[PDB]
Every structure is written in C-alpha cells, then in structure tokens.
Design a protein around this ligand. Sequence first.
Ligand SMILES: NC(=O)c1ccc[n+]([C@@H]2O[C@H](COP(=O)([O-])OP(=O)(O)OC[C@H]3O[C@@H](n4cnc5c(N)ncnc54)[C@H](OP(=O)(O)O)[C@@H]3O)[C@@H](O)[C@H]2O)c1
Ligand SMILES: [Cl-]
Length: 219
Amino acid sequence: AMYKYITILGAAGQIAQKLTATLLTYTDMHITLYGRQLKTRIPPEIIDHERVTVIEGSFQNPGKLEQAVTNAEVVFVGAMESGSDMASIVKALSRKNIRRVIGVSMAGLSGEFPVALEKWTFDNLPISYVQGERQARNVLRESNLNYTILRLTWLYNDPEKTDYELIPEGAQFNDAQVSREAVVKAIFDILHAADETPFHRTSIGVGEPGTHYDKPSFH
Ligand SMILES: NC(=O)c1ccc[n+]([C@@H]2O[C@H](COP(=O)([O-])OP(=O)(O)OC[C@H]3O[C@@H](n4cnc5c(N)ncnc54)[C@H](OP(=O)(O)O)[C@@H]3O)[C@@H](O)[C@H]2O)c1
Ligand SMILES: [Cl-]
C-alpha cells in the first residue's frame, strides 16, 4: 500500500466491512474502525485481529472521532449523506492535521446519468437523501483535504463480479450498477496508486462495465 495506517469511519457499513477484510487479507495495513456499537456488530475475527483497533462512536462525537484519526495516514469515509456529519468529520481531521481522505458518495447528482437511468434513479431516492449527499460533497470541497470522492452507482453484492471502471468528472455515467466487491477493489487500487495525481481532490465515478441499462438490475 501507499499508506500503513488507515482509519475507517462508518466501519459497519457494507462496503467498509468488505474493505476491512480485504485490507487485512491482502495488505499489512494497521486499521482503526470507527462507528456506532461496533463491538456488538463487527464480526469477532475482525475485532480480534492483531492489526485492528476498534473505537465506538458517532460522526457527531468530536473527541472519539479525533481519537480514531490520531495516527491515520489516510481516512476512508464510509458515508457522505449529511452536511453536518461531514462537517464534524472535517473538523476532527483538521484538529489532527490529517489530509488524505477517500469518501463514498452517490453518482447522478450533477446530471451525469443518461435520461432514463437518471429518471429511474431519482424516482427511487428521497429528495432529502439526494440533497444531503450534495451538501456533504460541498463540505468536503470546502475542506483543506487531499480528498478523493468516489461517485458510486447503484450497489449490489456479488463476489464473482469485481470488474470496475472509473468515470472522470463531467463524463456521461452510463453504468447503472456496480458490485460492492468491485468498489472495494477500486478503493484498494487507489490505496496502492504510485501516482495519486488523478485522485487528488477529484470526484471519480465507479461503475460496472457493460451495465448500460435504463435501471439497475442488481444482479
Ligand atoms: N444503496 C446504493 O445503491 C448506493 C449507491 C451509491 C452510494 N450509496 C451510499 O454510499 C455509501 C456506502 O455504501 P454502503 O453500501 O456501504 O452503505 P451502508 O451499508 O449504509 O454503510 C454506511 C455506514 O455509514 C455509517 N454512518 C452514516 N452516518 C453515520 C454517523 N452519523 N455516525 C456513525 N456512523 C454513520 C452507517 O452506520 P450505521 O449502520 O450505524 O447506521 C453505515 O454503517 C452509503 O452512504 C450509501 O448510502 C448507496
Ligand atoms: Cl470505544
């Protein structure tokens, strides 16, 4: 990896948990997991791993967040749903002068989906969720962070489908879906990128190739 110490914020999330297992199996990274009630949620083989540290708390707990990112070289933000939560995280990172962040957001906010997929997508999301995501993004942009935003299309689970393509900012986003396992691979690959340039304060889409559909199929 390009980093040794990573803090995963929102560590019980589906992508976060899969990322955790992948980083334990395939790297020598030291991982700090943060989120609500982790000790009674995260599997025992993860909690008891020598390279795992577990801290319980919410994105609105300044002291605990700061503890969680104290020794981080990179921070993964597992949800970007709330401006207020994003602000709390940015403030904690600022207090410890942590700079490198990878965050996951929803694709489509900027009109990048083609018309039918865009229509289906917004028919299937509350306005409040969408505008929350847009606000979280704005907060991250205002920060001093060397961030990468991953704009994810519709998610599903399939260990056999780990192919992904990155979609540059402003490009038409034609992929209607992507597996969580493929997103984990994309995160793994960015964490191993010798050249961070294309990921430096950029917003990149992640989609499954060949899923040019009018709606996600989730399989
Ligand atoms: N569903 C889709 O198709 C889709 C597509 C694109 C993007 N996304 C979004 O991309 C993100 C990652 O996907 P995912 O499948 O891994 O979602 P996920 O399972 O819901 O994981 C998100 C995690 O963030 C945690 N979290 C959010 N706010 C928090 C707070 N204030 N304090 C502590 N923890 C907090 C949640 O904790 P708790 O479990 O304790 O509530 C949850 O475990 C999510 O934000 C998701 O909504 C979803
Ligand atoms: Cl704790």
